[PDB]
Ligand code: HEC
């Protein structure tokens with residue numbers, strides 16, 4: 306495989322998510338009024354999350370459920386469904402990036418939330434309590 | 435104000451570099467003959483590197499030279515030149531992604547090395563030996 310050890314695959318997927326959470330939260334902060342809204346920065350954040358959302362799936366190689374991971378082994382008993390959720394995260398991220406082109410705020414908030422729903426949705430099922 | 439703590443920016447940039455190295459190295463492996471060349475996979479790897487290359491600069495905030503980092507203190511004293519090199523990496527990584535559209539290996543190899551020199555060039559000056 307691409308990764309020399311499972312720890313390399315675990316580290317890879319964790320970094321992809323961590324970089325994605327940093328960029329996603331900055332959009333949330335702008336939407337929730339915590340910091341000023343900047344369209345250019347918002348679209349940059351959208352670009353980042355979309356590109357980042359394409360990385361972590363590769364990290365979920367088989368046999369990487371043990372060790373320092375928050376991934377539940379149920380990911381690989383239902384890998385078909387897990388991949389589907391990840392593909393949806395990408396589609397929802399791609400939609401958010403398109404919305405960031407327009408300055409309709411109610412369109413930005415809802416397309417943002419459809420992504421947030423992906424984050425929470427997959428975590429509830431496949432990430433340790 | 436994006437990062438609550440200095441440790442968060444250090445982790446952010448370190449993760450970006452890590453994910454870029456994984457994808458960039460797979461391009462070298464195909465170009466250098468370690469693994470077979472796949473045009474489609476090459477372009478995906480190029481896409482990842484181009485997007486990943488736009489992330490780490492944000493991480494180099496003030497006061498983040500202390501702690502568990504490989505960044506030298508000279509980066510901030512020479513921040514103008516450091517930013518220019520990073521923006522150059524972004525430009526070169528974007529150039530590599532454009533090359534992957536071409537089927538010319540002599541261009542693919544050449545554009546890959548212009549990115550490779552960006553990595554080595556900045557490490558020699560701005561990363562602890
Ligand atoms: C399933 C298809 C997921 C989607 C969609 C998102 N995430 Fe997730 N995330 C998932 C797993 C299986 C894990 C565990 C990784 C491990 O091996 O530990 C995670 C982890 C995270 C983390 C923690 C990463 C770390 O620092 O160790 C974060 C911060 C995170 N995920 C954020 C995140 C966001 C912001 C998402 C939407 C924008 C998102 N994830 C989607 C599974 C899945």
Ligand code: HEC
Pocket residue numbers: 444447448449451452454455458502503504505506516519520523549550552553554556557560561
């Ligand atoms: C400066 C302008 C850089 C360019 C261009 C590239 N890298 Fe770099 N890299 C740089 C610094 C200052 C650091 C240290 C960051 C820290 O706070 O510790 C790094 C680190 C890396 C790492 C290690 C990441 C980790 O696991 O901690 C890797 C794997 C890495 N850099 C790779 C890399 C590649 C492949 C580059 C070109 C494609 C590249 N870097 C460019 C500074 C700079």
